[PDB]
Structure formats: structure tokens, C-alpha cells
Amino acid sequence: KLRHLSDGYWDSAARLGVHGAVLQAVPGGRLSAPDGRVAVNMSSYSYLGLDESPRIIDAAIAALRSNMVLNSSLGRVRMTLPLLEEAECALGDLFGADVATLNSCSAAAWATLPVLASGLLTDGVAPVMVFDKRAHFCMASLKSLCADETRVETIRHNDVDALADICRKNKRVAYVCDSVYSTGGTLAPLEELFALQKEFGLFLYFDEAHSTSVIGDMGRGYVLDRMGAINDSTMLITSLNKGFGASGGAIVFGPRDDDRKRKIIQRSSGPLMWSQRLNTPALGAIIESAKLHRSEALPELQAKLHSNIALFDGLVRAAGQGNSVPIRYLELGSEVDTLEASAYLFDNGFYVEPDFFPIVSRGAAGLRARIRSSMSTADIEQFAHVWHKLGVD
Amino acid sequence: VKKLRHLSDGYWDSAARLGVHGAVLQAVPGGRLSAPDGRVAVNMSSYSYLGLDESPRIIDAAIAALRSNMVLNSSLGRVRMTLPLLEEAECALGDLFGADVATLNSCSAAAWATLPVLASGLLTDGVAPVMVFDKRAHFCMASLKSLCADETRVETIRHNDVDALADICRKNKRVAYVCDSVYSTGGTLAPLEELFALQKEFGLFLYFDEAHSTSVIGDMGRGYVLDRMGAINDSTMLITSLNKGFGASGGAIVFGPRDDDRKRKIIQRSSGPLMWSQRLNTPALGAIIESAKLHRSEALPELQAKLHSNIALFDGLVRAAGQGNSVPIRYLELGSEVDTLEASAYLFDNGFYVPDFFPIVSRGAAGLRARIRSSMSTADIEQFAHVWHKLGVD
Numbered sequence: 001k002l003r004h005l006s007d008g009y010w011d012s013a014a015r016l017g018v019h020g021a022v023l024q025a026v027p028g029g030r031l032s033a034p035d036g037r038v039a040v041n042m043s044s045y046s047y048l049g050l051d052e053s054p055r056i057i058d059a060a061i062a063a064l065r066s067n068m069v070l071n072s073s074l075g076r077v078r079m080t081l082p083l084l085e086e087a088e089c090a091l092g093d094l095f096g097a098d099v100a101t102l103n104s105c106s107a108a109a110w111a112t113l114p115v116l117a118s119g120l121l122t123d124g125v126a127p128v129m130v131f132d133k134r135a136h137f138c139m140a141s142l143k144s145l146c147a148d149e150t151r152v153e154t155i156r157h158n159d160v161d162a163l164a165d166i167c168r169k170n171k172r173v174a175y176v177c178d179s180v181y182s183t184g185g186t187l188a189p190l191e192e193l194f195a196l197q198k199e200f201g202l203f204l205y206f207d208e209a210h211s212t213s214v215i216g217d218m219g220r221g222y223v224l225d226r227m228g229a230i231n232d233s234t235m236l237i238t239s240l241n242k243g244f245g246a247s248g249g250a251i252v253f254g255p256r257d258d259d260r261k262r263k264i265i266q267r268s269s270g271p272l273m274w275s276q277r278l279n280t281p282a283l284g285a286i287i288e289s290a291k292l293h294r295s296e297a298l299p300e301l302q303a304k305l306h307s308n309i310a311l312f313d314g315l316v317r318a319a320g321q322g323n324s325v326p327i328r329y330l331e332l333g334s335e336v337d338t339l340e341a342s343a344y345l346f347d348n349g350f351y352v353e354p355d356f357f358p359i360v361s362r363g364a365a366g367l368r369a370r371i372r373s374s375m376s377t378a379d380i381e382q383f384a385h386v387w388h389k390l391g392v393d
Numbered sequence: 394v395k396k397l398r399h400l401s402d403g404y405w406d407s408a409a410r411l412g413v414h415g416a417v418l419q420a421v422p423g424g425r426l427s428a429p430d431g432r433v434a435v436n437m438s439s440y441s442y443l444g445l446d447e448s449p450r451i452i453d454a455a456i457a458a459l460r461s462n463m464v465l466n467s468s469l470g471r472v473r474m475t476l477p478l479l480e481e482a483e484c485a486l487g488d489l490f491g492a493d494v495a496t497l498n499s500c501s502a503a504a505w506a507t508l509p510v511l512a513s514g515l516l517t518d519g520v521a522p523v524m525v526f527d528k529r530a531h532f533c534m535a536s537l538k539s540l541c542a543d544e545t546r547v548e549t550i551r552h553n554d555v556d557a558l559a560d561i562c563r564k565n566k567r568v569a570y571v572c573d574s575v576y577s578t579g580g581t582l583a584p585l586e587e588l589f590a591l592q593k594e595f596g597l598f599l600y601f602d603e604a605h606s607t608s609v610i611g612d613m614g615r616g617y618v619l620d621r622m623g624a625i626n627d628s629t630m631l632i633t634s635l636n637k638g639f640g641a642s643g644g645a646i647v648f649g650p651r652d653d654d655r656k657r658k659i660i661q662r663s664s665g666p667l668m669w670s671q672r673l674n675t676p677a678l679g680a681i682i683e684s685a686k687l688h689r690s691e692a693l694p695e696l697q698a699k700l701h702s703n704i705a706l707f708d709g710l711v712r713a714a715g716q717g718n719s720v721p722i723r724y725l726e727l728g729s730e731v732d733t734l735e736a737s738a739y740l741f742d743n744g745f746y747v748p749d750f751f752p753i754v755s756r757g758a759a760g761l762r763a764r765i766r767s768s769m770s771t772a773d774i775e776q777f778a779h780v781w782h783k784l785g786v787d
């Protein structure tokens with residue numbers, strides 16, 4: 001019955017044109033409506049502006065012109081195009097690990113979490129799957145698929161002490177979490193988790209979707225940066241279209257010289273086997289973005305991002321102020337107030353996506369902003385002016 | 394189940410050693426593959442049943458959509474807005490199938506996004522139905538039984554047992570049946586007449602997987618179900634793949650009637666991959682639009698005729714499992730896993746790539762899985778038959 005008012009907001013969101021509408025991509029991180037209104041996108045997941053990189057777009061087209069086919073042997077043969085190998089080898093040199101590409105980070109979780117619960121990745125010993133409470137939904141929805149294979153226990157957020165207790169009462173334990181948490185700005189306790197891993201052999205499973213391109217040298221990620229080189233007990237899934245400037249997702253199996261984890265997941269029954277690989281333009285974009293991630297352009301993009309983050313925090317008060325995570329939340333009074341503010345900001349040249357029930361709790365709606373390197377200093381200052389004029393009048 | 398892993402992984406290694414599994418080949422015009430060593434072989438196992446993976450109209454449209462939009466993501470920086478290209482793609486598929494259709498990155502993501510919602514009764518008047526899975530149902534759906542078991546009672550009947558399905562329909566209020574429209578292994582089709590009748594009598598929700606029926610079966614390629622059904626109702630749902638014949642990328646959910654938007658909105662606002670998982674990139678959407686327009690032209694009945702012509706030529710020259718079917722999937726039973734891998738290696742070195750073994754198929758039932766397509770020429774099929782017959786002698 002609670003759906004009575006939940007979907008009631010969705011219809012109010014689609015009516016005002018600030019949710020479920022149609023806008024065109026315009027250079028400069030800008031969206032254009034059919035009527036001619038141009039606004040600056042303040043919620044784009046492309047944290048480095050690589051979705052507008054002319055190098056990446058040309059490489060996607062160049063790969064499609066060369067191979068003259070969309071399928072890289074997806075939904076087809078167990079063979080593979082050289083493009084797909086060059087793509088997974090590019091991600092391999094970038095991350096320093098054995099990497100496989102999939103059509104989405106969600107497909108990576110579907111292909112890894114169950115077989116991880118089977119012990120095939122932990123020397124036949126079925127581990128105890130420990131999920132964080134704030135783990136992403138593409139992983140937590142598969143808890144039952146994991147439960148049919150071993151014991152599943154959900155602990156509260158960053159409860160390192162409760163996790164260590166299960167590591168003492170069981171021989172093999174695994175922890176599934178996010179490297180970077182969007183809602184809350186919290187981070188995975190790497191120092192505490194690497195201590196448990198060095199003692200009990202705790203298996204680590206990180207979702208690096210909000211961590212891949214924005215954190216670490218060469219944009220290797222929060223986990224891979226503070227760790228140095230991945231081991232045989234750490235596994236990463238990530239999305240390659242949120243800051244990486246490409247498409248699909250990837251499984252970061254482990255050590256580059258070790259083919260055992262890739263073989264075990266390949267020959268298992270999962271999306272890595274039956275589902276379709278990425279199309280040629282995505283693979284070409286992955287290659288070019290991997291080369292771009294290894295050049296001096298990426299640390300320059302990270303600097304402009306941190307620069308834009310500091311500018312935003314000094315001009316606008318938002319939940320998450322002071323983070324290194326470029327996600328800010330302008331918590332508004334109600335869902336109706338959330339929708340009307342977005343409509344006002346758009347007519348003055350700024351789109352900010354609205355969150356509400358049931359995505360967020362009742363009475364806790366607001367506008368979800370995301371900071372990217374491609375935003376200019378004038379864009380952020382002008383947004384803070386429009387945001388301040390709304391509050392007063 | 395734990396000792397057989399020694400003999401199974403031995404077949405994977407041998408298949409990779411012989412070069413017929415997991416090696417790197419380049420796509421060549423004319424349904425062909427090229428090795429780094431210059432060997433060119435005809436691909437006798439492609440899923441592009443109409444040869445639309447080589448269509449210059451579709452390829453050019455995929456390139457055009459990428460230059461025009463100058464971005465890869467169709468979700469406007471992955472926000473909850475959408476590019477006009479995506480609305481045009483779902484509208485093109487909607488005009489083709491005559492139904493309300495949404496696109497996803499894969500047909501697997503469609504099952505992950507629909508089967509839990511259907512099991513919760515949110516699509517069946519709030520009454521949680523009994524999920525009745527077919528035994529031969531695809532793994533992208535069968536692996537989600539536990540996700541459905543948390544929402545309702547889940548049963549698995551034997552293949553096409555319409556009698557056991559009718560019994561569940563009369564012992565429960567609401568019941569749904571998850572199956573494949575066309576089964577690749579076995580050449581078996583769905584009992585639509587019996588299924589439609591149980592739907593008319595009990596209200597049985599029909600959940601079809603048209604992955605091997607789209608483009609290959611029906612006027613304008615609307616699928617096996619939509620051809621014999623006419624127009625979809627509000628108790629039938631389809632999921633399909635757009636790379637196994639449609640000539641593009643990704644998958645799609647065929648919710649129901651074009652006018653009704655309730656099923657689309659229920660799944661969009663539900664905790665499903667249709668919400669958080671990334672949407673198809675621009676070139677995939679540009680290809681979908683062009684293939685949709687191509688499906689509505691006279692070229693598709695022409696390609697369907699060329700396909701059936703090649704099925705008849707193949708069946709008249711090669712004895713294979715499924716001979717006489719209208720589905721372009723043949724299986725050359727060789728039994729021995731070693732004979733299968735060696736037959737594939739011999740055929741490749743003679744110009745034709747075709748192999749299934751344990752654990753993909755049961756032990757002693759290994760063989761070569763061939764797939765007929767419109768892009769195959771008469772000489773391609775005749776020459777393969779000559780090579781396949783000289784393997785029988787020596």
C-alpha cells in the first residue's frame with residue numbers, strides 16, 4: 001500500500017520535466033532541451049569529463065570502422081576479436097592485474113559473487129560471505145544466490161570489530177563492500193581491512209565504481225593505490241562509464257601472472273560465459289582511455305577535479321562537504337520542494353538531479369550534485385549564485 | 394559433482410590447445426574468420442541468423458549516432474534523464490514489435506530486472522504468483538529462482554509438460570510460466586496453443602525468451618510468440634537479445650500493450666537493473682534504430698527466405714540433430730569429446746569453423762554446433778558438406 005505516495009512523487013517528478021525527460025548532450029557538460037534551453041549538467045557521473053574527450057570518441061569510431069562489426073564475438077563464438085584482447089590487456093597494464101570486460105559492472109557482480117561463495121576462488125573452502133550494509137544493490141540483491149552456497153551475514157556499515165569476530169570463528173571469510181560509498185561519503189577501512197587480510201586471510205571484494213578514475217596514481221583506484229599490487233585474496237569489480245569515459249564494466253581478478261581465477265569464472269555458468277561481451281566501439285574507447293589514464297593528462301584532470309571540489313565546498317553548504325569524493329547532496333525539505341528547486345535552477349541554466357522517496361527516506365529528499373573536472377570556475381560560481389538566490393527569494 | 398572437474402577442465406585445456414576454443418580471430422567479410430597465421434575459415438556457428446552483423450546500413454547508423462551525439466553514454470552522464478536517441482530506439486522497437494519495449498545492455502539484465510518483480514506479484518494484481526520454471530529454460534533466467542524463491546513459491550516442471558503446468562494452475566490463484574520461445578538444444582518450440590489456452594482458462598502469465606526467435610521467425614521478425622499471437626496482451630512478457638540475429642547490441646524487455654505503461658513504470662521504479670545499470674551506448678542505439686527500420690522493410694522477408702533456403706540445402710547434404718526443423722540450429726553428434734575437438738580442428742584447417750563438450754553438454758553427447766545464416770552462400774554450404782563427408786571416410 002505504501003506505493004500509494006511513493007509513485008505519487010514519480011508522477012510529480014515527470015510532470016515538472018526534472019525526471020524521466022529527454023535532453024541532448026552539448027559540448028561543455030551541457031544539456032539542451034528541444035525548446036532551446038541550455039543548462040550545465042551538475043550531476044554527471046563522468047568525474048573527469050572523459051565522456052567529452054575527443055580522443056576517446058574518435059577511437060570508438062575508429063575501432064568500429066576498422067572491424068566493420070559490432071560484435072566482438074559476443075552472443076556468438078567462444079573466440080574473440082583482437083580488439084577485445086587489446087582492451088583487456090590495456091586494462092591489465094593500467095591496473096597491473098588480470099582484467100576481463102563485461103557489458104556492465106552489474107554483470108561482473110553476477111559472474112563473481114556466486115562462484116566466490118562456492119569456494120572455487122578460496123581453495124575449495126566455501127567462505128562466509130560478509131556483506132556490508134551500504135554495499136551497492138547490484139551485489140546485495142544476489143545475497144540469496146550466495147546463500148544457496150554458504151552462509152551469508154550482513155553487518156553494519158564499516159563494523160570492523162564485528163567482521164573480525166567472524167574471522168575468528170570461521171576458517172575462511174570474505175567481505176563484500178564498496179571502495180567508495182556515494183550516499184554518505186564514507187570510505188572502506190583499507191588499513192583495518194588489510195590488517196585482517198594479513199592475519200586471518202580475509203578475502204576482499206570491492207566495488208570500485210566511484211573509485212576507479214578519480215582516485216590513485218594513473219587512476220587505478222582507492223584499493224589499488226593504497227595497496228600497491230593486488231594479491232590472490234583481493235578482487236575488484238568496477239564500472240567503466242563513470243569517470244573512465246567508456247562503457248561496460250570489468251572484473252579485476254588478481255595477479256597478472258595468475259590465470260586461475262579467470263579460468264574458474266569463465267568455465268562457470270555466469271554472464272561471463274553466456275552473456276554478450278562489449279561492442280567494438282566500447283572496446284576501442286577502453287583502449288584509448290587506458291592509454292590516456294597512463295599519460296600525464298590524468299593527474300592534470302584529477303587536479304582540476306580537486307580544484308573544482310574545493311571551490312564548490314567554499315560556496316555551497318551540502319552534505320558531504322569536505323570529502324574527496326565528488327558527490328554532494330543538497331538536502332531539501334520535502335520531495336515537492338526538491339522538484340520545484342530543480343525546475344527553477346534549470347530555467348537559469350543548471351540541471352541538478354532530484355532524489356526522493358523511495359530512492360531516499362521520507363522527508364530526506366534533495367538534489368544530488370556531482371563534481372567533475374570539465375566544470376569551469378565560472379560554472380561553479382554561477383551555480384552557487386543561482387542556488388543562493390533561490391533560498392532568499 | 395566435485396570429481397568430474399578433473400575431466401572437464403581437461404577438455405577446456407585441450408580445446409584451447411587445439412585452437413578451437415578461446416583463441417583470437419579477426420572478423421572477415423563474408424561470414425569468415427582469419428587467424429594470425431593467414432588461415433581463413435567460414436564461420437559455421439554465427440548467431441547473426443540473417444547476416445545483419447555485416448549490414449552496411451546498420452554499421453553506418455552506429456557510426457552516425459556516435460558522431461552526431463559526440464558521447465558514448467545515452468543516459469546523459471548516467472543521470473536519470475535520457476538522450477533523444479534512446480527514446481527513438483525504444484520507439485522504433487515499439488513500432489516493430491507493437492508493444493511497449495525498453496532496452497538494456499543484455500538479455501540477461503532483462504531477466505534480472507523482470508523475474509524478481511514478476512515473482513513479487515507487482516505485475517499480477519498484487520497476488521504473488523507461483524513461479525513455474527521450465528527445465529530447459531535458459532540459465533540467465535533459471536539462475537534467478539532463488540531471487541524468486543524469496544518472493545513466492547518456485548516450482549520446476551519437466552520440459553513442455555503442459556499437464557503438470559495445468560495442475561499448478563488449478564491448485565493456485567495466480568501462476569506464471571518461464572520458458573524459451575525457441576530452444577537451441579533440442580530444436581523444441583514452445584507449446585503456444587496449449588499455453589495460450591491455459592492462459593485463457595486460468596490467466597497463466599507467460600514469460601517468453603525470444604532470443605532465438607527474434608528476426609528469424611515471423612512477419613517483420615516480431616518473434617515466434619508475437620507471430621502466432623498477433624498482438625501482445627497484459628499477461629505476456631518477452632525478453633530477447635539484439636545481437637543474436639537482430640544485428641545490433643543489448644537486449645530488451647517487451648512489457649505488454651503499447652498503450653499501457655504500468656508494467657514499465659512498476660519495473661523502472663522497482664529495485665531492478667533497469668534503474669542503476671548503465672544503458673546501451675549511442676552506437677548500439679543507432680544500430681537498433683536502423684535494424685528496426687530494416688526489419689519493417691521488404692528486406693527481412695527476403696533474408697528469411699534466403700535463410701530457409703540455406704536450411705534446406707544444409708539438411709539435404711548433412712545429417713545432423715534437428716534435421717528438418719525451421720530453426721537454423723544443427724548439432725553434429727560425435728559423442729567422443731576427443732573426436733569432437735579433433736573434428737573441429739580438422740574442419741578449421743580445411744576452411745570451416747564449427748564444438749560443445751562437458752560440462753556444456755553431457756558426457757558422451759559432445760559434438761559440433763552449427764548455425765545457419767542468410768549470409769552463407771550455396772558454395773559455402775556445399776563445400777562444407779564435402780569436407781564433412783571426407784572426414785567420415787578419412
Ligand SMILES: *Cc1c(COP(=O)(O)O)cnc(C)c1O
Pocket residue numbers: 075274275276499500501502531533573577602604605633634635643644
Ligand atoms: C543465448 C541466449 C540468451 C543470450 O542473452 P544475452 O545476455 O543477450 O547474451 C538469452 N536467452 C536465451 C534463451 C538464449 O539462448
Ligand SMILES: *Cc1c(COP(=O)(O)O)cnc(C)c1O
Pocket residue numbers: 104105106107136138178182207209210238239240242248249669670671672
Ligand atoms: C553506479 C554504480 C554502479 C553501476 O554499475 P553498472 O552496471 O556498470 O551500471 C555499480 N556499483 C556502484 C557502487 C555504483 O555506484
